[PDB]
Design a protein around this motif. Structure first.
Motif, PDB file in Angstrom:
ATOM      1  N   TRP A   1       0.804  -1.233   0.000  1.00 52.80           N
ATOM      2  CA  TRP A   1       0.000   0.000   0.000  1.00 52.80           C
ATOM      3  C   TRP A   1       0.841   1.291   0.000  1.00 52.80           C
ATOM      4  O   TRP A   1       0.442   2.296  -0.586  1.00 52.80           O
ATOM      5  CB  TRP A   1      -0.943  -0.003   1.209  1.00 52.80           C
ATOM      6  N   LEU A   2       2.035   1.278   0.611  1.00 54.01           N
ATOM      7  CA  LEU A   2       2.951   2.426   0.599  1.00 54.01           C
ATOM      8  C   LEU A   2       3.618   2.631  -0.767  1.00 54.01           C
ATOM      9  O   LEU A   2       4.018   3.751  -1.081  1.00 54.01           O
ATOM     10  CB  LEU A   2       4.034   2.256   1.680  1.00 54.01           C
TER      11      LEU A   2
ATOM     12  N   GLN B   1       0.437   6.149  -7.258  1.00 56.23           N
ATOM     13  CA  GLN B   1      -0.915   6.711  -7.399  1.00 56.23           C
ATOM     14  C   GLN B   1      -1.992   5.685  -7.814  1.00 56.23           C
ATOM     15  O   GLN B   1      -3.050   6.067  -8.295  1.00 56.23           O
ATOM     16  CB  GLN B   1      -0.907   8.004  -8.246  1.00 56.23           C
TER      17      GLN B   1
ATOM     18  N   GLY C   1      -9.239   4.127   8.291  1.00 56.80           N
ATOM     19  CA  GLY C   1      -9.124   5.568   8.054  1.00 56.80           C
ATOM     20  C   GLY C   1      -8.272   5.913   6.828  1.00 56.80           C
ATOM     21  O   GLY C   1      -8.631   6.805   6.068  1.00 56.80           O
ATOM     22  N   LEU C   2      -7.174   5.184   6.598  1.00 55.80           N
ATOM     23  CA  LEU C   2      -6.322   5.359   5.416  1.00 55.80           C
ATOM     24  C   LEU C   2      -6.935   4.738   4.148  1.00 55.80           C
ATOM     25  O   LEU C   2      -6.865   5.358   3.095  1.00 55.80           O
ATOM     26  CB  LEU C   2      -4.924   4.788   5.710  1.00 55.80           C
TER      27      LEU C   2
ATOM     28  N   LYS D   1     -10.257   4.345   3.532  1.00 56.01           N
ATOM     29  CA  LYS D   1     -11.349   5.277   3.227  1.00 56.01           C
ATOM     30  C   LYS D   1     -10.849   6.603   2.648  1.00 56.01           C
ATOM     31  O   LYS D   1     -11.492   7.166   1.771  1.00 56.01           O
ATOM     32  CB  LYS D   1     -12.170   5.461   4.514  1.00 56.01           C
ATOM     33  N   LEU D   2      -9.691   7.100   3.099  1.00 57.12           N
ATOM     34  CA  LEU D   2      -9.047   8.284   2.513  1.00 57.12           C
ATOM     35  C   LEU D   2      -8.357   8.005   1.165  1.00 57.12           C
ATOM     36  O   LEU D   2      -8.163   8.951   0.409  1.00 57.12           O
ATOM     37  CB  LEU D   2      -8.066   8.908   3.523  1.00 57.12           C
ATOM     38  N   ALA D   3      -8.023   6.751   0.843  1.00 55.00           N
ATOM     39  CA  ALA D   3      -7.600   6.357  -0.501  1.00 55.00           C
ATOM     40  C   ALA D   3      -8.806   6.276  -1.450  1.00 55.00           C
ATOM     41  O   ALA D   3      -8.766   6.885  -2.512  1.00 55.00           O
ATOM     42  CB  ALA D   3      -6.805   5.047  -0.431  1.00 55.00           C
TER      43      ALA D   3
ATOM     44  N   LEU E   1     -11.603   7.941  -1.134  1.00 52.56           N
ATOM     45  CA  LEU E   1     -11.966   9.360  -1.295  1.00 52.56           C
ATOM     46  C   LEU E   1     -10.903  10.201  -2.045  1.00 52.56           C
ATOM     47  O   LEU E   1     -10.973  11.431  -2.018  1.00 52.56           O
ATOM     48  CB  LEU E   1     -12.316   9.949   0.088  1.00 52.56           C
ATOM     49  N   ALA E   2      -9.925   9.560  -2.692  1.00 51.88           N
ATOM     50  CA  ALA E   2      -8.882  10.201  -3.504  1.00 51.88           C
ATOM     51  C   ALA E   2      -8.578   9.481  -4.840  1.00 51.88           C
ATOM     52  O   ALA E   2      -7.868  10.044  -5.670  1.00 51.88           O
ATOM     53  CB  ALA E   2      -7.627  10.335  -2.631  1.00 51.88           C
ATOM     54  N   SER E   3      -9.100   8.268  -5.048  1.00 50.04           N
ATOM     55  CA  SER E   3      -9.065   7.493  -6.298  1.00 50.04           C
ATOM     56  C   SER E   3     -10.204   7.872  -7.250  1.00 50.04           C
ATOM     57  O   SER E   3     -11.329   8.078  -6.792  1.00 50.04           O
ATOM     58  CB  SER E   3      -9.216   6.005  -5.960  1.00 50.04           C
ATOM     59  N   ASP E   4      -9.966   7.828  -8.565  1.00 47.44           N
ATOM     60  CA  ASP E   4     -10.991   8.039  -9.607  1.00 47.44           C
ATOM     61  C   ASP E   4     -11.927   6.817  -9.807  1.00 47.44           C
ATOM     62  O   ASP E   4     -12.127   6.319 -10.919  1.00 47.44           O
ATOM     63  CB  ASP E   4     -10.369   8.556 -10.926  1.00 47.44           C
TER      64      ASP E   4
END
Lengths: 289, 330
Positions: free
Chosen positions: B111-112, B118, B146-147, B149-151, B153-156
């Motif tokens: 994941w890192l 991207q 939390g990470l 869900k924030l991925a 909320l940042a992926s197309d």
């Protein structure tokens, strides 16, 4: 109220989104002073303190969105500090309710949001003044005599004291500014620049300005708080900002741009890499073996 | 066709290559150890010579000069099996299509590199898998969700697939909110810390909420303890109905079924009981008490009630409130 509201309305300026731009040195002009020096008209008579606070909020909303933090603080000082209690005094004498009406409960809540934001700015201003004051380490002279070595010991053994005092003040300022930034980012129930009285009257200039200020201020405070924590080495708290921003109690993820959630994921990874090369997991837990 | 001779001679060669060259390395002769290790492909002694000189430019030359010989895949094992973690992720984009194929054996680090590529759609799912696997630390499961869900909320993702994964994760947030909202006295009396305790299954969260140490347990904790029955899988050896009985029995044991001063109606007096307040919640929240509740015969044949199982005022008032709240729904 008409003098103050006509002066509030002289700006034929829609809230454009390009003006996110890094304007510098945007200090209080004569056209700002003619809006600081207008709140007096609602402060001469106590029977107008509720309106002084409602219109004072409106001019502070303009200055905070305009990045004129000192002009917003000049208007905050035009509102006398008794005014929240005076707005309750004007309720209990005379055939009203237990709080002052639904425009004004929301206005007191909004002025308390603005005060908590000014606390979260001035504690950052002093933290930043102090962080840039860092004691410079005494440079090593090449091939120095016995006298110059004693005259380097008697510099380094002062830097040991000066830097110890300077960090003893930095960690204290780093606790205060962190209280203030959490008080704004985790602000009570409804949260910062949101109302509670659905029995209130519509002001769509106010509601638009509050929904805009939540998007200018709360992402910015998260980028400041990450930078405060990261520059002091508090790298695991820098990551707990992700669970705060995703939290369904405050829904801060609704007030960032997608590009700023990506900037936040990029900054979260700065602290995650500093935890890894410290010998911790990507989230700051022990590497057990 | 002579492979049994070959692989043993190849191991004889590989061992004796390390035996002969590792003294040149450990005597610091990094020119001479490497002139032979570049001629005879000793990738350990080449990578050792690089970290022993921090020579990342000669290392990147090897990752270009021995690409046809998988030197980068060897180096990624070499950064793992003993290691320093930052140097594995901070590699050039031209080797990311090899690093991702090594990190397909290291989900806890992949994941890192997915985020650093991207590929946020992967990082969402990888962090969700790691969150499902994280039973050992409650605060780490929360941080992985939390990470994740924030991925997402940042992926197309498309608006439909994004609502699917927002809701799939929102139910895992709703589940973990039952562990987040454990009373601070219950946590202190059991000496538990939300930052260092494991994740708990629904029977274990139920078992905490209804226990004697919850000396503040109320119509919200005894609502959580019923709502947690909706988070139990069909392969636990656990009768959900006997949990449901024991939850209701322990609510009835928090309520004071002693007799009043002989002037007072037991359907008025019951309205401050936490048992009646959970019935009023189930009714307000839409549930049929005629189908959802155990029988008044057998709630009285459960043994958990102990002392109350001898009290005829409890026997009457339990029946009068079951009659009032169930015949109030017909």
């Amino acid at each position: 109220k008409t003098v103050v509201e006509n002066i509030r309305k002289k700006d034929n300026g829609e809230f454009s989104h390009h003006d996110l731009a890094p304007a510098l040195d945007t200090g209080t002009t004569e056209e700002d002073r003619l809006k600081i020096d207008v709140i007096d008209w609602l402060v001469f008579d106590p029977a107008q303190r509720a309106e002084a606070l409602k219109q004072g909020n409106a001019i502070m909303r303009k200055f905070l969105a305009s990045k004129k933090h000192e002009a917003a603080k000049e208007v905050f000082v035009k509102i006398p500090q008794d005014s929240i209690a005076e707005i309750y005094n004007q309720c209990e004498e005379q055939g009203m309710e237990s709080p002052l009406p639904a425009e004004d409960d929301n206005a007191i809540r909004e002025h308390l949001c603005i005060r908590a934001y000014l606390e979260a700015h001035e504690t950052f201003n002093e933290w930043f003044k102090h962080m840039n004051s860092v004691p410079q380490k005494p440079a090593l002279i090449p091939q120095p005599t016995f006298t110059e070595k004693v005259a380097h010991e008697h510099k380094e053994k002062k830097y040991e004291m000066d830097f110890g005092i300077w960090k003893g003040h930095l960690d204290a300022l780093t606790a205060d500014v962190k209280e203030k930034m959490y008080n704004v980012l985790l602000f009570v129930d409804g949260g910062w620049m949101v109302d509670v009285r659905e029995d209130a009257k519509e002001d769509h200039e106010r509601t638009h300005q509050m929904v805009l200020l939540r998007k200018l201020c709360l992402p910015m405070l998260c980028f400041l708080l990450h930078t405060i924590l990261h520059s002091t080495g508090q790298y695991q708290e820098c990551l707990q900002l992700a669970d705060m921003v995703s939290s369904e109690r405050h829904k801060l993820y609704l007030v960032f741009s997608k590009e700023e959630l990506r900037k936040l994921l990029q900054k979260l990874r700065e602290s995650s890499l500093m935890l890894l090369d410290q010998g911790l997991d990507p989230l700051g837990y022990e590497i057990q073996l | 066709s002579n492979r049994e001779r070959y692989d043993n001679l190849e191991m004889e060669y590989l061992q004796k290559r390390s035996d002969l060259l590792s003294p040149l390395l450990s005597l610091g002769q990094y020119l001479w150890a490497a002139s032979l290790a570049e001629k005879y492909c000793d990738f350990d002694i080449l990578v050792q010579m690089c970290e022993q000189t921090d020579n990342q430019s000669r290392l990147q030359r090897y990752m270009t000069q021995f690409a046809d010989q998988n030197f980068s895949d060897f180096l990624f094992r070499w950064y793992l099996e003993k290691g320093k973690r930052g140097k594995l992720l901070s590699q050039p984009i031209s080797q990311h299509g090899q690093l991702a194929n090594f990190l397909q054996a290291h989900e806890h680090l992949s994941w890192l590199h997915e985020i650093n590529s991207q590929e946020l759609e992967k990082a969402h799912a990888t962090l969700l898998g790691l969150a499902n696997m994280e039973t050992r630390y409650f605060a780490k499961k929360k941080t992985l969700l939390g990470l994740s869900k924030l991925a997402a909320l940042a992926s197309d993702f498309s608006e439909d697939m994004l609502q699917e994964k927002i809701e799939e994760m929102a139910e895992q947030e709703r589940f973990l909110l039952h562990q987040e909202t454990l009373p601070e006295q219950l946590l202190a009396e059991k000496q538990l810390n939300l930052s260092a305790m494991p994740v708990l299954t629904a029977p274990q969260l139920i078992g905490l909420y209804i226990c004697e140490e919850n000396r503040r347990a109320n119509e919200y904790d005894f609502k959580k303890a019923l709502d947690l029955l909706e988070y139990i899988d069909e392969e636990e050896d656990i009768n959900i109905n006997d949990l449901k009985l024991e939850i209701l029995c322990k609510a009835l044991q928090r309520d004071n079924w002693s007799s009043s001063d002989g002037k007072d109606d037991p359907i008025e007096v019951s309205k401050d009981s936490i048992f009646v307040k959970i019935l009023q919640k189930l009714l307000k929240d839409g549930i049929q008490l005629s189908e959802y509740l155990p029988e008044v015969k057998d709630l009285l044949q459960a043994d958990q009630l102990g002392s109350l199982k001898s009290n005829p005022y409890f026997e009457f008032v339990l029946k009068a409130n079951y009659e009032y709240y169930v015949q109030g729904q017909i």
